[PDB]
């Protein structure tokens, strides 16, 4: 209700798509995207940073890679604080790969304290054709110095022109000697490829080209040398075309090479080209066509110009598998479609990932980004658009990741991922209902009580359709514990907008009404024919969001020309420098910055002087005289500011208009203001903080007909906060729910008493007692009393519930703070002396109410005639208070049921395990201790050896061991009754495991493992025996009490039967 509509900031940039994405940044700027704006040739999307001070927007300078084509920069924005970072993305990058064109995304990570870097860190790569390339260079004597030196520079030039590991190289220098300088495997393993070429020295000697080519074919192209199978095999022969002393001819080795499918390039050195014999030597070596496979040694461009080659991938379009085809993986990923900041790093949502099954990439600094998505097994996730929206959630330490999948089975769903053992894993889901409702389009984590732990995830379904309204927001509390995630309630906008798109945008504005509960803001860009609207929902105790909106702001309400108002939202920061949280709303071609107004609270105190009207007023010879008696009334208005975090706010001037009424509704008013001539008065006074009183003059006629009913004075007021002139005419305002009508009674001219008791209980258990009944007996022994009012005073957890004598009751807060009060006036009734009324007053006791260990209920009693009071007859009674909780321990399903041992296995033993699990099904956190009672001995003989309590899950617990001596009984008789070995007859080993805080719905898993011995059974004289261990929960019994009726579940037991067969 405190969003300022009249004083408004407007950001207008005529760029295409401006305002489609907004975000608050560094508590300074409103960063705005314009994804359709054409910035450069074959480049789209732009950023604009806007300021409250400037009142204008300036382009954010960013240099964009040339391969980033039409990225739609600013389609999704994200920001965080401490340190302040900005993440601006563009998921529509067109990348040409072969005859395909992929669709990936690019993002820029910005920050004032750091340098701008990009995400993902490296460019998307087109799949390249594998090709294994062998250099074969002539190092014979005919090759000399600068020629041989040139050949190496040719090799260096080539190696630099080919990417890895698409292409790997192998070099062999030949003469009459053969030396492989580096194999394929050596090249691939090489930290730096160029380092290998430094040690190459010419061999001189004769020239054996053919046998060398043979040696290359039968060796350098093999799996043993690191040559890849699918790789296109290319052999570059570098020679001067002079072969001497070779026992082989080309026609002997070349066909063997052709059969291997080896492409050959002939690079000519020196006089190789001009000599007719040396030129034939080149033609023979090179593959056909010869003109395309022969080049000089000086031409470095020659080799690359033909190939920078790719592998042609054939996609499986429309979800249909051809036998040759290949499934979509990350080619259409569109990384950065949505983005959010997490403690461990940024997270970019990639929608098109794996046939649009969606997902998200976590990008920790200087590490391999981990991909987060549904498991491969889940095929229904295809075309679900997972990661369409991304949002962070936190429960205490644990960070979780919520991803939206608005297309899932045409219905849509949201999924929560958390890290389990160094790898991400789905913990919970929640599915929408209506088809095409786009459930999971927008995600918003809400922390209501500001304890740092997320309580409430808001999930948008913008296209949810009903006949009279459209759009929907599902309030989904985090699936804490192991309960399945489900939506607690649902929020709608106002009706009349079937396609209003309520829930398109979601943001947290923070606590704006000062109830210490987080408030949220939801957008509806489609309302009244795509003008748009924005709603404000207050937070609610026991974390939920209020069913009805506190304030709705339509696009038409603010301006004409306004379209799609609310299509983007960002709040929670202060950008108007007044210390109050502000809201940045997106719109078509515009971005509006709205500011929250400071909230004021007004209280009234009204008294009359004198207290009770002297009856000397009405006593006459019947003079027609009136207004002969004057009455003074002291009215005080004190104004406390609710917003305790407002910059400035030292002199808050506030204009108030007072109205007054004397006995309103009555035909003949019994009072008149000395000033006005009637019974109606008005006052206009500028008021500040603290307090401001004022006296008024009342006139009472001499003789009046009604002397029974007290005179009433009704007060109301409107409050218009004066603009502060600092902070640009920002105005305070009265709370919307505030009481405007105040009434004080002036009595006409007894000793009363009060008493009550609590029927049914000596103690109050909170959570188990939702109501409180007090049997109130009031008596009047003395003079008759008029307008008897029965006043109660109690802690905050109590309230007067009216059930179906006649009473009229009203309830309002009193005291320093923390105490409330409910005074119940009784009339229709003259309360005559000696007569007593007994009635049942019922109080609602909150389940979360904190009453401490003591509940004090005090009861006042008063009449219209004000006695001196302090005459006792105010009754207080105290009630001991405990707090309910449901905690269960139970024997797990999987444990050691029995152990079979032959009559000859006395010496031996076997591993036995007992498992218990403890759950908090109550509504209250609680410090519990868990006790484990395990037999380890029987008559100083070993029974259960090396027992150790373990808890792999929740591995931050802490246990101790304590020996026990058994109450010495005749066990042979104790066994004879029932063959059971436990702490009664046997030596026990007590385990205490303390839990400092046992969270609600949290589960604790314990395991008692050890070696169960066989020998001790011979003491028993039974064929089989039961070995029993006991688990028991203990909490502070003075502060807490187990849920009434469920006491038996606080201890559990587990039995392992030792049986002996005979062979």
């Amino acid at each position: 209700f405190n969003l300022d509509t009249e004083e408004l900031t407007a950001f207008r940039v005529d760029s295409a798509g401006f305002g489609d994405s907004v975000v608050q940044y560094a508590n300074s700027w409103v960063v705005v995207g314009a994804p359709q704006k054409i910035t450069a040739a074959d480049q789209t999307g732009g950023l604009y940073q806007c300021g409250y001070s400037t009142g204008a927007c300036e382009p954010i300078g960013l240099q964009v890679p040339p391969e980033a084509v039409n990225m739609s920069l600013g389609l999704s924005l994200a920001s965080t604080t401490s340190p302040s970072q900005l993440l601006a993305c563009g998921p529509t990058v067109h990348h040409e790969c072969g005859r395909n064109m992929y669709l990936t995304g690019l993002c820029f990570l910005l920050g004032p304290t750091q340098l701008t870097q990009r995400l993902p860190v490296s460019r998307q790569e087109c799949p390249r054709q594998e090709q294994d390339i062998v250099f074969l260079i002539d190092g014979s004597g005919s090759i000399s110095s600068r020629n041989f030196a040139t050949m190496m520079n040719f090799v260096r030039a080539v190696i630099s022109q080919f990417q890895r590991p698409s292409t790997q190289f192998s070099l062999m220098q030949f003469s009459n000697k053969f030396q492989t300088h580096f194999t394929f495997e050596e090249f691939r393993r090489s930290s730096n490829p160029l380092s290998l070429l430094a040690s190459v020295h010419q061999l001189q000697g004769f020239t054996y080209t053919a046998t060398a080519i043979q040696n290359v074919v039968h060796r350098l192209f093999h799996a043993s040398y690191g040559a890849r199978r699918d790789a296109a095999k290319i052999l570059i022969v570098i020679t001067d075309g002079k072969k001497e002393g070779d026992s082989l001819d080309y026609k002997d080795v070349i066909p063997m090479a052709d059969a291997a499918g080896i492409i050959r390039y002939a690079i000519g050195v020196g006089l190789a080209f001009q000599n007719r014999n040396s030129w034939k030597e080149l033609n023979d070596i090179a593959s056909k066509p010869s003109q395309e496979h022969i080049f000089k040694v000086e031409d470095f461009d020659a080799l690359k110009d033909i190939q920078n080659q790719l592998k042609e991938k054939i996609f499986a379009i429309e979800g249909t598998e051809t036998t040759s085809s290949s499934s979509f993986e990350l080619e259409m990923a569109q990384e950065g479609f949505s983005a959010v900041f997490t403690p461990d790093g940024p997270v970019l949502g990639a929608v098109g990932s794996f046939t649009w099954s969606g997902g998200a990439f976590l990008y920790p600094p200087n590490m391999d980004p981990t991909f987060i998505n549904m498991s491969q097994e889940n095929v229904d996730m295809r075309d679900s658009y997972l990661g369409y929206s991304t949002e962070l959630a936190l429960w205490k330490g644990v960070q979780s990741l919520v991803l939206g999948a608005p297309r899932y089975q045409h219905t849509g769903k949201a999924v929560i991922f958390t890290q389990v053992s160094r790898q991400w894993r789905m913990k919970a889901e929640v599915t929408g209902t209506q088809i095409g409702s786009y459930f999971g389009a927008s995600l918003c984590s809400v922390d209501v009580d500001s304890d740092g732990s997320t309580d409430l995830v808001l999930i948008g379904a913008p296209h949810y359709y009903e006949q009279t309204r459209g759009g929907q927001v599902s309030v989904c509390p985090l699936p804490r514990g192991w309960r399945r995630w489900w939506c607690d309630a649902v929020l709608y906008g106002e009706q009349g907008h079937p396609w209003g798109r309520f829930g398109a945008a979601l943001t947290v504005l923070g606590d704006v009404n000062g109830d210490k509960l987080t408030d949220v803001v939801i957008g509806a860009p489609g309302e009244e024919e795509n003008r748009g609207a924005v709603y404000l929902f207050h937070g609610v105790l026991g974390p939920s969001i209020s069913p009805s909106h506190s304030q709705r702001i339509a696009g038409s309400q603010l301006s004409s020309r306004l379209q799609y108002f609310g299509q983007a939202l960002s709040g929670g920061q202060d950008l108007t420098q007044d210390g109050l949280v502000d809201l940045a709303v997106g719109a078509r071609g515009q971005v509006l910055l709205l500011r929250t107004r400071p909230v004021l609270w007004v209280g009234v105190s009204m008294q009359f002087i004198p207290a009770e009207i002297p009856r000397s007023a009405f006593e006459c010879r019947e003079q027609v005289v009136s207004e002969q008696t004057l009455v003074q009334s002291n009215i005080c208005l004190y104004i406390d500011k609710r917003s305790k975090n407002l910059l400035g706010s030292r002199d808050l001037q506030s204009s108030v208009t007072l109205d007054l009424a004397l006995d309103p509704g009555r035909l003949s008013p019994r009072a008149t203001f000395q000033e006005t001539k009637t019974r109606s008065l008005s006052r206009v006074r500028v008021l500040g903080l603290k307090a401001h009183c004022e006296n008024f003059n009342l006139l009472l006629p001499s003789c009046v007909e009604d002397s029974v009913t007290p005179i009433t004075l009704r007060l109301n007021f409107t409050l218009v906060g004066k603009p502060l002139l600092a902070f640009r005419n920002l105005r305070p305002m009265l709370a919307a729910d505030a009481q405007r009508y105040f009434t004080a009674s002036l009595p006409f001219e007894d000793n009363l008493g009060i008493s009550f008791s609590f029927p049914g209980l000596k103690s109050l258990l909170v959570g188990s007692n939702l109501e409180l009944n007090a049997e109130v007996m009031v008596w009047n022994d003395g003079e008759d009393s008029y307008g008897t009012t029965i006043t109660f005073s109690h802690p905050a957890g109590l309230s007067y519930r009216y059930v179906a004598l006649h009473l009229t009751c009203d309830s309002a807060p009193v005291g320093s703070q923390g105490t409330w009060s409910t005074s119940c006036r009784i009339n229709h009734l003259i309360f005559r002396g000696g007569a007593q009324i007994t009635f049942l007053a019922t109080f609602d006791v909150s389940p979360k109410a904190v009453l401490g260990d003591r509940l004090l209920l005090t009861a006042n009693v008063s009449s219209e005639s004000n006695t001196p009071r302090t005459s006792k007859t105010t009754f207080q009674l105290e009630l001991p208070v405990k707090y309910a909780v449901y905690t269960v321990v139970s024997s797990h399903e999987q444990f050691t049921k029995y152990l079979c041992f032959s009559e000859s296995e006395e010496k031996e033993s076997h591993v036995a395990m007992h498992r218990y699990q403890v759950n908090n099904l109550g509504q209250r956190d609680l410090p519990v201790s868990i006790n484990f009672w395990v037999p380890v001995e029987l008559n100083q003989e070993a029974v259960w050896m090396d027992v150790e309590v373990s808890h792999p899950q929740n591995p931050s617990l802490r246990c101790s061991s304590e020996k026990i001596a058994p109450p010495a009984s005749d066990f042979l008789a104790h066994i004879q009754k029932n063959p059971v070995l436990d702490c009664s007859i046997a030596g026990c080993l007590r385990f205490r495991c303390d839990v400092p805080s046992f969270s609600v719905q949290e589960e604790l898993d314990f395991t008692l493992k050890g070696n169960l011995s066989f020998g001790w059974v011979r003491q028993i004289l039974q064929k089989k025996v039961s070995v029993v261990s006991v688990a028991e929960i203990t909490f502070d019994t003075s502060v807490y009490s187990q849920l009434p009726g469920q006491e038996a579940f606080m201890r559990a037991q587990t039995t392992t039967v030792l049986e002996k067969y005979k062979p």
Binding site: I435, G436, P462, G665, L667, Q1046
Partner: protein, 665 residues
């Protein structure tokens, strides 16, 4: 019936007080020491006090039809409504036999529909043949769709734009959102030749832009060529569909405006707009009375079936592998459409509530449903719907229409208020109406014998106080001429009323923060909240009835909890919402050991009354999802079994391992 006092000053006010109130026009029906608040009461208590049957004023809601047919009748209705009393009139629907049909065949030309295309080219003759067998004036048309021509939906590389098909086949066509092939015509031969020229196309992702096409078909009736007859739109595909919100992947944020965008039989601005919403399409379809027939493959039937919930006049028929059964599909779909008839009303004000009674020739009857629903409607076999209209207020002049979904025929309902009476001295300032004097302004009395401000003497105040211990007019009213005139409070929704001014409309129990749910589900009258139609409760805190307690198959909080006010009341530790699972309960494995032994192994203590001893156990010879159990049997051997819980009290699905664990033994 029941009548509770509110406004007791006048005749019309007596009727406004309640739907079970009556007013007596007998002059001096009151005694000398009686108030006139006793003139307004229930009909029995009037007769019981001797009020004549002739002079009792009881306006009753009336329905009057001016006849004007035989499909939707009557087409003119005038309703006179008393607040609280429901007027009723009948609507007769008799299905007409020979109304013409325009059938537009919207074909998926995506590459996945390659094998389907061949059969569709032969369809022309057979389609019109079957159509002309159903009704006369048969007309067939054709259109085609693929998807929006941008990534990720379509590979936009110029080479794969010109030839989208994966294999190099030579009979292919570049991608397109929607193309209109043939305007609706009676010529079968045209269809065959024009559709014959159409080639197969292709694109990237599985769901297609079919909804884009349907929206255009509905928005361009002149281009398509619909007559104002019954309209069929056959939607044929093997996959899913894109809807609103999916355009953002192509950086398309502009909503479908639901208008015609055709450039030479083509949807060229397809990339400038987002896919239409299902809610958008449903509205546009229903507005143009275009009934879609979704012909989808087996894998896609359950999905498209969901659309029928949003689109009332639609049907889903399973399409055979190569679209061979398409004709039998259409006729079966048409029967499904024609056999079911919905009766509904256009937009209603907050004052009027309308329910329907459905009397079908099927042999089935529904009572008081928000929409008339009859299935199995046969031709010329008339069904009747009973319309019940109730007004909360005295209402102004209004007209709302009732029509049968699928047809342009309408029933015009006129609504007039009925708050008046037609009723058959007063010492000066009062003129007499309906058995009592209505005094001039500033004057009040049974015969107008007093003045508001004036004398107002003693001993007439004897009637003013409730008893000897009560304050005169409860202190909330002034005593004029023996009776009480209550004070006026400026608090909204607050009114002091009553003979002794002892009642107020503010004091009641609270739901939410407000009184009786505020100005919503209920209004407050002297401690008791009188709830608006459709709601109930003490403070009216519970909402309506039993829908918040159901599992998706309507078993109502499993079998482990009974429902009151949508909050499931379940025993033991079974938690909310549907009372399905008990986390605090002990493991049931222990007690069922004898039942497991008798079921699987014929032995054990329950030998031969196994069926009588185990009423809740249902034996399964295959493994189940339940919890693991293992105990010793009657002879000491270990028996393993698993217990899966079913909806009900102690009802499990048990599986037992045939292998037992003995020691040897």
């Amino acid at each position: 019936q029941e009548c509770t006092k509110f406004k007791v000053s006048s005749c019309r006010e007596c009727i406004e007080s309640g739907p079970g109130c009556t007013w007596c026009q007998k002059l001096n029906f009151t005694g000398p020491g009686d108030p006139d608040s006793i003139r307004c009461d229930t009909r029995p208590q009037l007769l019981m006090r001797g009020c004549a049957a002739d002079d009792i004023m009881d306006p009753t809601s009336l329905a009057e039809t001016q006849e004007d047919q035989k499909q939707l009748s009557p087409q003119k209705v005038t309703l006179y409504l008393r607040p609280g009393q429901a007027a009723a009139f009948n609507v007769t629907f008799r299905r007409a036999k020979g109304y013409p049909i325009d059938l537009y065949y919207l074909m998926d030309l995506s590459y996945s529909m390659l094998d389907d295309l061949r059969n569709v080219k032969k369809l022309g003759g057979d389609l019109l043949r079957a159509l002309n067998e159903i009704t006369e004036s048969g007309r067939i048309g054709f259109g085609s769709f693929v998807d929006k021509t941008v990534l990720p939906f379509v590979n936009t590389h110029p080479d794969k734009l010109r030839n989208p098909c994966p294999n190099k086949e030579k009979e292919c066509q570049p991608p397109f959102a929607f193309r209109h092939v043939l305007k609706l015509t009676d010529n079968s031969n045209q269809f065959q030749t024009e559709v014959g020229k159409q080639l197969i196309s292709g694109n990237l992702d599985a769901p297609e832009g079919g909804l884009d096409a349907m929206m255009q078909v509905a928005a361009c009736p002149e281009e398509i060529g619909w007559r104002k007859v019954t309209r069929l739109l056959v939607f044929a595909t093997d996959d899913g569909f894109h809807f609103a919100g999916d355009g953002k992947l192509g950086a398309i944020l502009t909503p479908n405006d639901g208008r015609c965008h055709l450039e030479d039989n083509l949807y060229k601005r397809s990339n400038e707009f987002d896919y239409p919403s299902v809610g958008q399409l449903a509205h546009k379809l229903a507005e143009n009375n275009i009934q879609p027939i979704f012909a989808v493959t087996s894998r896609m039937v359950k999905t498209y079936e969901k659309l029928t919930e949003i689109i009332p006049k639609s049907a889903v028929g399973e399409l055979s592998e190569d679209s061979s059964n398409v004709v039998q599909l259409i006729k079966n779909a048409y029967n499904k459409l024609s056999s079911r008839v919905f009766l509904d009303h256009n937009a209603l004000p907050d004052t009027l509530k309308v329910t329907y009674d459905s009397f079908c020739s099927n042999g089935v009857t529904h009572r008081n449903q928000p929409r008339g629903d009859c299935d199995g409607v046969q031709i010329n076999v008339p069904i009747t719907f009973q319309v019940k209209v109730t007004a909360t207020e005295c209402i102004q002049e209004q007209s709302f229409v009732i029509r049968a979904l699928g047809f342009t025929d309408i029933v015009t309902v006129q609504v007039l208020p009925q708050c008046e009476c037609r009723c058959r001295l007063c010492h000066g300032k009062g003129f007499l109406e309906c058995g009592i004097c209505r005094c001039d302004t500033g004057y009040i009395g049974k015969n107008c014998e007093c003045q508001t401000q004036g004398r107002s003497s003693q001993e007439l105040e004897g009637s003013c106080r409730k008893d000897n211990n009560s304050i005169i007019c409860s202190g909330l009213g002034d005593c004029v001429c023996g009776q009480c005139l209550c004070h006026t409070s400026d608090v909204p929704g607050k009114l002091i009323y009553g003979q002794y001014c002892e009642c107020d409309t503010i004091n009641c129990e609270r739901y939410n923060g407000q009184v009786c749910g505020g100005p919503g589900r209920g209004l407050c009258f002297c401690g008791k909240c009188r709830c608006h139609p459709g709601f109930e409760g003490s403070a009216c805190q519970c909402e309506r009835t039993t829908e918040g307690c159901l599992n998706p198959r309507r078993v109502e909080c499993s079998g482990r909890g009974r429902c009151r006010c949508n909050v499931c009341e379940c025993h033991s530790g079974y938690q909310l919402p549907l009372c399905q699972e008990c986390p605090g309960c002990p493991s049931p494995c222990g007690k069922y050991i004898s039942c497991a032994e008798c079921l699987k192994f014929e032995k054990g203590p329950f030998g031969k009354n196994c069926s009588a001893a185990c009423p809740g156990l249902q034996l399964s010879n295959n493994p189940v999802k339940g919890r693991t159990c293992k105990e010793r049997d009657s002879e000491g051997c270990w028996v393993a079994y698993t217990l899966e819980q079913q909806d009900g009290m102690d009802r499990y699905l048990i599986y037992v391992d045939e292998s037992r664990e003995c020691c040897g033994g």
